[PDB]
Structures are given as C-alpha cells and as structure tokens.
C-alpha cells in the first residue's frame, strides 16, 4: 500500500482548505510528512 498521503493528515490539510491534490503534491515531495508538506503545499 503505497500511501504517501495519510488520510488523517489529508483531511487535516484539506482542513486548511486545500485540495486532495495538494496533499499528494506536497507530501509526495516531502514523502508524506504532514506538517512539512502542508507548509510545502502552502506554496500554491
């Protein structure tokens, strides 16, 4: 199960008002580490 994007955090990042696409783009580059990737997704 290659889930870089953990639903909990996904919804937490979506919780910031983002798309699911944002969890994936950001956590992909950060390899799924929520807080970090949120700050990453923040770029867009």
What 3-state class would DSSP assign to 1? Answer: coil
Residue 35 host element (H or E): helix 34-41
Q: What's the burial of 10, exposed, middle or buried (CB within 10 Å: 0-12/13-18/19+)?
A: buried
CB 32, CB 7: distance < 8 Å = no
Q: 28: Cβ–Cβ under 8 A, 6 or more apart, which residues?
A: 4, 5
∠8-13-16 over CA atoms, to 5°? Answer: 135
Which domains are present in the chain?
Answer: 1-44 (1.10.8.10)
DSSP per-residue codes, 21-32: HHHHHHHHHHTS
In the structure encoding, which two tokens stand for residue 30, read together?
């950060």
3-state DSSP assignment of residue 5: coil
- Identify the H or E element spanning 7: helix 7-14
């Amino acid at each position: 199960g290659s889930a870089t994007f953990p639903e909990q955090t996904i919804k937490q990042l979506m919780d910031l008002g983002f798309p699911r696409d944002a969890v994936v783009k950001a956590l992909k580059q950060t390899n799924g580490n929520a807080e970090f990737a949120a700050s990453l997704l923040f770029q867009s």
